[PDB]
């Protein structure tokens, strides 16, 4: 189906306690495959998926150069932003940068995006045309002007429309055995009495990849969204995900409630009951 190559970069100042902490992570779809952390034992770009361990020293060198350069520019950006907002040299501040390219199911470029945040909210955003920027306030307006002066959108558009697409294809080949594998959920229901006349039904989905899933409870074959407790999809730690949904029902009526599971890995949507 659709695929995406995305990165998340975070730089956090720590006045008096060193250069800002800088962490970069790359994902293909829901799979992390690289990281750069300037506090790590090896503060370079390194593999974080098994299928990247073969890549060769030229790749790590180019990515380390790029990441180091990004950390340096972000360090400067944090100083500049302090100046724009008239903030003290004493506080910790955060600069975040996210970018990605997305291919549709037909294999072709669908969309690219790129955004910056300062202290946890939008700062500067690349427009959908990939040719211009939106600034949140008069500070980011200065950043927009500098980007215009330096034709920064041209550099970002070449990356998103070309380089990003090219490497996404390469990474999908290198990691195909796991990136293209759909792993369906293993599902079951648990049942626990909660009062003299009620019980919890909990519908579990375990061990699935990718993360996208729909878990719902129905009562007599109709929607029951308002009365369902849902947890956020959470990582198992082995590259698969988990989720559950629970409802509280009258004792003796369990059989009228059905759990419905939709996931790309299932031949057909599944239903389970107690």
């Amino acid at each position: 189906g659709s695929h995406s190559l995305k990165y998340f970069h975070t730089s956090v100042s720590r006045p008096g306690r060193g250069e800002p902490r800088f962490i970069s992570v790359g994902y293909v779809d829901d799979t992390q495959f690289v990281r750069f952390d300037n506090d790590a034992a090896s503060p370079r770009m390194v593999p974080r998926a098994p299928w990247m361990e073969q890549e060769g020293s030229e790749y790590w060198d180019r990515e380390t150069r790029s990441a180091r350069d990004t950390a340096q520019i972000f360090r400067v950006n944090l100083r500049t932003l302090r100046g724009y907002y008239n903030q003290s040299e004493a506080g910790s501040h955060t600069l975040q940068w996210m970018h990605g390219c997305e291919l549709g199911p037909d294999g072709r470029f669908l969309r690219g995006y790129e955004q910056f945040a300062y202290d946890g909210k939008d700062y500067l955003t690349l427009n959908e045309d990939l040719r211009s920027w939106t600034a949140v306030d008069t500070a980011a307006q200065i950043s927009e002007q500098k980007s215009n002066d330096a034709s920064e959108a041209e550099h970002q558009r070449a990356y998103l429309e070309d380089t990003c697409v090219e490497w996404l294809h390469k990474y999908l080949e290198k990691g195909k055995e796991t990136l293209l594998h759909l792993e369906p959920p293993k599902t079951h229901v648990t049942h626990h009495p909660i009062s003299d006349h009620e019980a919890t039904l909990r519908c579990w989905a375990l061990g699935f990849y990718p993360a996208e899933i729909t878990l719902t409870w129905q009562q007599d074959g109709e929607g029951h969204t308002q009365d369902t407790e849902l947890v956020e999809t959470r990582p198992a730690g082995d590259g698969t995900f988990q989720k559950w949904a629970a409802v509280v029902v009258p004792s003796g009526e369990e059989q009228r409630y059905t759990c419905h599971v939709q996931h790309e890995g299932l031949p057909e949507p599944v239903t389970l009951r107690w």
């Binding site: 990441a67 990004t70 950006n77 932003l81 950043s143 500098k146 330096a150 920064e152 550099h155 490497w167």
Partner: peptide, 9 residues
């Protein structure tokens, strides 16, 4: 890979 240009703000 990551972009070869990181924007200056």
């Amino acid at each position: 890979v990551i972009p070869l240009s990181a924007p200056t703000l």
